[PDB]
Amino acid sequence: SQVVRIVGVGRTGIGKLHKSVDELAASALKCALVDANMKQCDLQALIAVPSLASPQFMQAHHIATVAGLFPTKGKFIVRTVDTGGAGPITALGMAVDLVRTRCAETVAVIAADAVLSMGSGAFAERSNASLRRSGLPEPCIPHGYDRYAQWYMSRYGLKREQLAMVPVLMSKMAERHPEAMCQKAYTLDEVLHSRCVAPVTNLLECARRADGAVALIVSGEAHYAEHFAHLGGSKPIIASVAEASGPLFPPGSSDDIVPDIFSCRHAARDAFLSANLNVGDIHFFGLYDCFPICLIQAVEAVGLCPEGKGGEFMETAYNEMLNNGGVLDPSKFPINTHGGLQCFGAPWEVPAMYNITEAIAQLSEEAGDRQLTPVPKRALVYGNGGIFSASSVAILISDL
Amino acid sequence: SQVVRIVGVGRTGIGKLHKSVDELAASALKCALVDANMKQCDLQALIAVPSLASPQFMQAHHIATVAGLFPTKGKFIVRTVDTGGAGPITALGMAVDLVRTRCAETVAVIAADAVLSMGSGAFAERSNASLRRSGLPEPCIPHGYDRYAQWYMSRYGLKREQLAMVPVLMSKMAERHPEAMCQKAYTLDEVLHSRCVAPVTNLLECARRADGAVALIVSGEAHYAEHFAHLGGSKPIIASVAEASGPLFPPGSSDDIVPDIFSCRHAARDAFLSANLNVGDIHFFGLYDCFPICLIQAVEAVGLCPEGKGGEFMETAYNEMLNNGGVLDPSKFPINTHGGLQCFGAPWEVPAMYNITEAIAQLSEEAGDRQLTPVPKRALVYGNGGIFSASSVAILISDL
């Protein structure tokens, strides 16, 4: 059809589950079909993303085979896409494509990994290998992000302490979510005295490795109601999805870096246009946050504050918090009320899915102690890949 | 940008090339760009497929980074897709989609691998790994198709020598191609005397490991004419693209195998229906042929002979060859005039690219000693990944 909604959501718990990637992927898919009032047979496509713990040739085909989705009710398109942490939204965009071009009317999007159970040595070897030719000291991704952090300090006047604040705010958010890995909030000093991983990035500022899988069912507005029917927020309209890209790793000069290297605003800029919406009208933001500089660059890009003022955005919330509890009220910082990759958890390419599930929870008034009030009608979700290498942004709204 | 063409084509040599996968991709992309009278700056997207020799997280981003596609001028979306050997055709559709929604005005599609320079030991392990949990005896990939072959032999009455006839015919096409790995034709008796690999699979019935890369530039017709202007066949219109899929490996019973598994039929009908053409408008077929059972299944699925009679299709074509030389006349067998994966060469996920490049040569009356006369106006190309797991079909036309 033309209007396409997220019609089902299924996920496993997050943490150390001691289960294989195929085991996790299958469970998330069985939950999502139950949540959508569907059977396997009612699905006509699947897009999935690669797993770091269990790398696999034709992963979506491998997952779809092992989960027993075959034989199928006719044609059945299967695809695997790799854009790193931007993946789940990229695939959500393709899912809309398949429904719009009528190659399939319902699409499942799956992300699954087990990078916590894999062990610190294995995760390090595999994640660091992925960045060959970067010239990045180990750990490569944190040092890769570490470099952009350091470059930001000198061009825009960002403060080191503004970095360390990013995990403070996410921790405040995490403790109202029972499933989040971080259940005890951090202090700004706790973060700074944490074991140094890269020069301006400490341990508590790194994404929180976790196992987990999430599945989404995507369907056409018209198609779904006649066979399986606020199912606005609860089964939101995907208004738009858009992408943009950049280098897989930063330049080796520490400078020569330029504002167009960062790729998030153009993805966001495009998603608004397809949706006929804009930023002041978005009141829940799910923003990728693998390291402090990643979340900082993001709030600029979707349009919550001007370029360069991203460190300032966090502090006013951190200050607004300190002289108020410190209770971080969602409604003044309606951003990553789940804790993000910092404090909810980060299964490699999976965790952008958690921005989507938290968008639906806020939109469906299912956010508990974390509920944004008044309830937002529209949400923005963001996934980022590599080291600012892939950006894809979606717009989810309850009502048209 | 309504009529969409392959605006550039570049490829490296094939063989044992003593080159990295990134050198090949970069060399082919610069060739494809020279071919279009374009520079790096004119690209607005990049799509690639994974490499077995140099497996890489976010493979396409890695290529564009190392090859220096960054920093970029205006919008440059990058994605990696894995549908196995179906990838280049899967990717061609994404490229066309990207052109229609104006998410990018010019697209590079890149496939590069080096499974020959990588060594025979490594090729066996990594390819065997791909079918983990299948239960297929090693080597796994040959053993899997082999199973469908006996199912063909036992369901449709297919015979051993009719399978073995495929590489004879492919050797004949290959000997007229200056680049093909195989430079001297086989006898049907030598293929049958070839080293037994699986029950119905001999050494000469297997794809010929090779290094190589091919790049395509896809753009809108007017756009190419309005910004960069045989300008038909040499830069053909992509008339249609479609896909369908199946299991990554067989159930392992031969009695669980059913005609409804195969997806080439589903892919072909949609490519036909979407182009508003049918088999009669096509006079060249580039058909993925990793093993005889694939080419046999393909010609039936596309409609060159009834279901089950694909081995008979080969026998009647091989017989006529003998009754002319034995000279294989193209017009009696307008299929894989370059030699295919059997005898031209097969760099893992790349060789569907060779079906397209041989289609362009045929369409442009530049196929030399293999040239079909009268010049074909339309071709159908087909790629396969895994074990009848992915089907991708395209249709290219010279002028509308």
Coordinates of N, CA and C in Angstrom, one line a residue, chain A residues 137-264:
Chain A
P137 N 44.6 3.2 17.0 CA 45.2 2.4 18.2 C 44.0 1.7 18.8
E138 N 44.3 0.5 19.5 CA 43.3 -0.3 20.1 C 42.8 0.3 21.4
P139 N 41.5 0.3 21.7 CA 40.4 -0.2 20.9 C 40.1 0.8 19.7
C140 N 39.9 0.3 18.5 CA 39.9 1.1 17.3 C 38.6 2.0 17.2
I141 N 37.5 1.5 17.4 CA 36.3 2.3 17.4 C 36.2 3.4 18.4
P142 N 36.5 3.0 19.7 CA 36.6 4.1 20.7 C 37.6 5.2 20.4
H143 N 38.8 4.8 20.0 CA 39.8 5.7 19.6 C 39.4 6.5 18.3
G144 N 38.6 5.8 17.5 CA 38.1 6.5 16.3 C 37.2 7.6 16.6
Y145 N 36.2 7.2 17.5 CA 35.3 8.2 18.1 C 36.1 9.2 19.0
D146 N 37.0 8.7 19.7 CA 37.9 9.5 20.6 C 38.5 10.7 19.8
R147 N 38.9 10.4 18.5 CA 39.5 11.5 17.7 C 38.5 12.6 17.4
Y148 N 37.3 12.3 17.1 CA 36.3 13.3 16.8 C 35.9 14.0 18.0
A149 N 35.9 13.4 19.1 CA 35.7 14.1 20.4 C 36.8 15.2 20.6
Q150 N 38.0 14.8 20.4 CA 39.1 15.7 20.5 C 39.1 16.8 19.5
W151 N 38.6 16.5 18.3 CA 38.5 17.6 17.3 C 37.4 18.6 17.6
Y152 N 36.3 18.0 18.2 CA 35.2 18.9 18.6 C 35.6 19.9 19.7
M153 N 36.4 19.4 20.6 CA 36.9 20.2 21.7 C 37.6 21.5 21.3
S154 N 38.3 21.4 20.1 CA 39.0 22.6 19.7 C 38.4 23.5 18.7
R155 N 37.3 23.0 18.0 CA 36.6 23.9 17.0 C 35.4 24.6 17.5
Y156 N 34.7 24.0 18.4 CA 33.4 24.5 18.9 C 33.4 24.9 20.4
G157 N 34.5 24.5 21.1 CA 34.6 24.9 22.5 C 33.9 23.9 23.4
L158 N 33.6 22.8 22.9 CA 33.0 21.7 23.7 C 33.9 21.4 24.9
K159 N 33.3 21.1 26.0 CA 34.0 20.9 27.2 C 34.1 19.4 27.5
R160 N 35.3 18.9 28.0 CA 35.5 17.5 28.4 C 34.3 17.0 29.3
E161 N 33.9 17.9 30.2 CA 33.0 17.5 31.2 C 31.6 17.3 30.5
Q162 N 31.4 18.0 29.4 CA 30.2 17.9 28.6 C 30.0 16.5 28.0
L163 N 31.2 15.9 27.7 CA 31.2 14.5 27.3 C 30.8 13.6 28.4
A164 N 31.4 13.7 29.5 CA 31.2 12.9 30.7 C 29.7 13.0 31.2
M165 N 29.0 14.0 30.9 CA 27.7 14.2 31.2 C 26.7 13.3 30.4
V166 N 27.1 12.9 29.2 CA 26.2 12.1 28.4 C 25.9 10.8 29.1
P167 N 26.8 10.0 29.7 CA 26.4 8.9 30.5 C 25.7 9.2 31.8
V168 N 25.8 10.4 32.3 CA 25.1 10.8 33.5 C 23.6 10.9 33.2
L169 N 23.2 11.6 32.2 CA 21.8 11.7 31.7 C 21.2 10.4 31.3
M170 N 21.9 9.5 30.6 CA 21.4 8.2 30.2 C 21.2 7.3 31.4
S171 N 22.1 7.3 32.3 CA 21.9 6.6 33.6 C 20.7 7.0 34.4
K172 N 20.4 8.3 34.3 CA 19.2 8.8 35.1 C 18.0 8.2 34.4
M173 N 18.0 8.1 33.1 CA 17.0 7.5 32.3 C 16.9 6.0 32.5
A174 N 18.0 5.3 32.5 CA 18.1 3.9 32.6 C 17.4 3.3 33.8
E175 N 17.6 3.9 35.0 CA 17.1 3.3 36.2 C 15.6 3.3 36.4
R176 N 14.8 4.0 35.5 CA 13.4 3.9 35.5 C 12.9 2.8 34.5
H177 N 13.9 2.2 33.8 CA 13.6 1.0 33.0 C 14.2 -0.2 33.6
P178 N 13.3 -1.1 34.0 CA 13.7 -2.3 34.7 C 14.6 -3.2 33.9
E179 N 14.6 -3.1 32.6 CA 15.3 -4.1 31.8 C 16.7 -3.6 31.4
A180 N 16.9 -2.3 31.6 CA 18.2 -1.6 31.3 C 19.3 -2.2 32.1
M181 N 20.5 -2.3 31.5 CA 21.7 -2.9 32.2 C 22.1 -2.0 33.3
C182 N 22.0 -0.7 33.2 CA 22.4 0.2 34.2 C 21.2 0.5 35.1
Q183 N 21.3 0.1 36.4 CA 20.2 0.3 37.3 C 20.6 1.2 38.4
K184 N 21.8 1.6 38.4 CA 22.2 2.6 39.4 C 22.9 3.8 38.6
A185 N 22.3 5.0 38.8 CA 22.8 6.1 38.1 C 24.3 6.5 38.4
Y186 N 25.0 7.1 37.5 CA 26.4 7.5 37.7 C 26.4 8.9 38.2
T187 N 27.5 9.3 38.9 CA 27.8 10.7 39.2 C 28.8 11.2 38.2
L188 N 28.9 12.5 38.0 CA 29.8 13.1 37.0 C 31.2 12.8 37.3
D189 N 31.5 12.4 38.5 CA 32.9 12.2 39.0 C 33.2 10.7 38.9
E190 N 32.1 9.9 38.9 CA 32.2 8.5 38.8 C 32.6 8.1 37.4
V191 N 32.1 8.9 36.4 CA 32.4 8.7 35.0 C 33.9 9.1 34.8
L192 N 34.3 10.2 35.3 CA 35.6 10.7 35.1 C 36.8 9.9 35.7
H193 N 36.4 9.2 36.8 CA 37.4 8.4 37.5 C 37.4 7.0 37.0
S194 N 36.5 6.7 36.0 CA 36.4 5.4 35.4 C 37.7 5.1 34.6
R195 N 38.0 3.8 34.5 CA 39.1 3.3 33.7 C 39.2 3.9 32.3
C196 N 40.3 4.6 32.0 CA 40.5 5.3 30.7 C 40.6 4.2 29.6
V197 N 39.8 4.4 28.5 CA 39.9 3.5 27.4 C 40.6 4.2 26.2
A198 N 40.2 5.4 25.9 CA 40.9 6.3 25.0 C 41.1 7.6 25.7
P199 N 42.0 8.5 25.2 CA 42.3 9.8 25.8 C 41.2 10.6 26.4
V200 N 40.1 10.9 25.6 CA 39.0 11.7 26.2 C 37.7 10.9 26.3
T201 N 37.9 9.6 26.4 CA 36.7 8.7 26.5 C 37.0 7.7 27.5
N202 N 36.2 7.6 28.6 CA 36.4 6.7 29.7 C 35.5 5.5 29.5
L203 N 35.7 4.5 30.3 CA 34.9 3.3 30.3 C 33.4 3.5 30.4
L204 N 33.0 4.3 31.3 CA 31.5 4.5 31.5 C 30.9 5.3 30.4
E205 N 31.8 5.8 29.5 CA 31.3 6.5 28.3 C 31.2 5.7 27.1
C206 N 31.5 4.4 27.2 CA 31.4 3.4 26.1 C 30.1 2.7 26.1
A207 N 29.7 2.3 24.9 CA 28.5 1.5 24.7 C 28.5 0.3 25.6
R208 N 27.3 -0.1 26.1 CA 27.2 -1.2 27.1 C 26.9 -2.5 26.4
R209 N 27.9 -3.3 26.1 CA 27.8 -4.5 25.4 C 26.7 -5.4 26.0
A210 N 25.9 -6.0 25.2 CA 24.8 -6.8 25.7 C 24.4 -7.9 24.6
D211 N 23.7 -8.9 25.0 CA 23.1 -9.8 24.1 C 21.6 -9.4 23.9
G212 N 21.1 -9.7 22.7 CA 19.7 -9.4 22.5 C 19.3 -9.4 21.1
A213 N 18.0 -9.6 20.8 CA 17.5 -9.5 19.5 C 16.1 -8.8 19.5
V214 N 15.8 -8.2 18.4 CA 14.5 -7.5 18.2 C 14.0 -7.7 16.8
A215 N 12.7 -8.0 16.7 CA 12.1 -8.2 15.4 C 10.9 -7.2 15.2
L216 N 10.8 -6.6 14.0 CA 9.7 -5.7 13.7 C 8.9 -6.3 12.5
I217 N 7.6 -6.2 12.6 CA 6.7 -6.5 11.4 C 6.2 -5.2 10.8
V218 N 6.4 -5.1 9.5 CA 6.1 -3.9 8.8 C 4.9 -4.3 7.8
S219 N 3.9 -3.4 7.7 CA 2.8 -3.8 6.8 C 2.1 -2.6 6.3
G220 N 1.4 -2.8 5.2 CA 0.6 -1.7 4.6 C -0.6 -1.4 5.4
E221 N -1.0 -0.1 5.4 CA -2.1 0.3 6.3 C -3.4 -0.5 5.8
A222 N -3.6 -0.4 4.6 CA -4.8 -1.1 4.0 C -4.8 -2.6 4.2
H223 N -3.7 -3.3 3.9 CA -3.6 -4.7 4.0 C -3.9 -5.3 5.4
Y224 N -3.3 -4.7 6.4 CA -3.3 -5.3 7.7 C -4.6 -5.4 8.4
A225 N -5.5 -4.3 8.2 CA -6.7 -4.3 8.9 C -7.7 -5.3 8.5
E226 N -7.7 -5.8 7.3 CA -8.7 -6.7 6.8 C -8.4 -8.2 7.2
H227 N -7.2 -8.4 7.7 CA -6.7 -9.7 8.0 C -6.3 -10.0 9.5
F228 N -5.8 -8.9 10.2 CA -5.3 -9.2 11.5 C -5.7 -8.1 12.6
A229 N -6.4 -7.1 12.2 CA -6.9 -6.1 13.1 C -7.9 -6.6 14.1
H230 N -5.0 3.2 21.4 CA -4.5 3.9 20.3 C -3.5 3.0 19.5
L231 N -3.9 2.4 18.4 CA -3.1 1.6 17.5 C -2.5 2.5 16.5
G232 N -2.2 3.7 17.0 CA -1.5 4.8 16.4 C -0.1 4.6 17.0
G233 N 0.1 5.3 18.1 CA 1.3 5.0 18.9 C 1.7 3.6 19.1
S234 N 0.8 2.7 19.2 CA 1.1 1.3 19.5 C 1.5 0.5 18.2
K235 N 1.0 1.0 17.1 CA 1.4 0.4 15.8 C 1.6 1.6 14.8
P236 N 2.7 2.3 15.1 CA 2.8 3.6 14.4 C 3.0 3.6 12.9
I237 N 2.7 4.7 12.3 CA 3.0 4.9 10.9 C 4.4 5.2 10.7
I238 N 5.1 4.5 9.8 CA 6.5 4.9 9.4 C 6.3 6.0 8.4
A239 N 6.5 7.2 8.8 CA 6.1 8.3 7.9 C 7.2 8.4 6.8
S240 N 8.4 8.2 7.3 CA 9.5 8.4 6.4 C 10.8 7.7 6.9
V241 N 11.7 7.4 6.0 CA 13.1 6.9 6.4 C 14.1 7.5 5.4
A242 N 15.2 7.9 5.9 CA 16.2 8.5 5.0 C 17.6 8.2 5.4
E243 N 18.6 8.2 4.5 CA 19.9 7.8 4.8 C 20.9 8.8 4.3
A244 N 22.1 8.6 4.8 CA 23.3 9.4 4.4 C 24.5 8.7 4.9
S245 N 25.7 9.0 4.4 CA 26.9 8.2 4.6 C 28.2 9.1 4.7
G246 N 29.2 8.5 5.3 CA 30.5 9.1 5.3 C 31.6 8.1 5.4
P247 N 32.9 8.6 5.6 CA 34.1 7.7 5.7 C 34.0 6.7 6.7
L248 N 34.6 5.5 6.6 CA 34.5 4.5 7.6 C 35.3 4.8 8.8
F249 N 36.3 5.7 8.7 CA 37.1 6.1 9.8 C 37.7 7.5 9.5
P250 N 38.1 8.2 10.6 CA 38.5 9.6 10.5 C 39.9 9.7 9.8
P251 N 40.2 10.9 9.3 CA 41.5 11.3 8.7 C 42.6 11.2 9.7
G252 N 43.8 10.9 9.2 CA 45.0 10.7 10.1 C 45.8 12.0 10.4
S253 N 45.1 13.1 10.4 CA 45.8 14.4 10.7 C 45.2 15.0 12.0
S254 N 44.2 14.3 12.5 CA 43.4 14.8 13.6 C 42.5 16.0 13.2
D255 N 43.0 16.8 12.2 CA 42.2 17.9 11.7 C 41.9 17.5 10.3
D256 N 41.6 18.5 9.4 CA 41.1 18.2 8.0 C 39.7 17.7 8.1
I257 N 39.2 17.5 9.3 CA 37.9 17.1 9.5 C 37.0 18.3 9.3
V258 N 35.8 18.1 8.7 CA 35.0 19.2 8.3 C 33.5 18.8 8.6
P259 N 32.7 19.9 8.9 CA 31.3 19.6 9.3 C 30.5 18.7 8.3
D260 N 30.9 18.6 7.1 CA 30.1 17.7 6.2 C 30.5 16.2 6.3
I261 N 31.6 16.0 7.0 CA 32.0 14.6 7.4 C 30.9 14.0 8.2
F262 N 30.3 14.7 9.1 CA 29.2 14.2 9.9 C 28.0 14.2 9.0
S263 N 27.3 13.1 9.1 CA 26.2 12.8 8.1 C 24.8 12.7 8.6
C264 N 24.6 12.9 9.9 CA 23.2 12.8 10.4 C 22.1 13.8 10.1

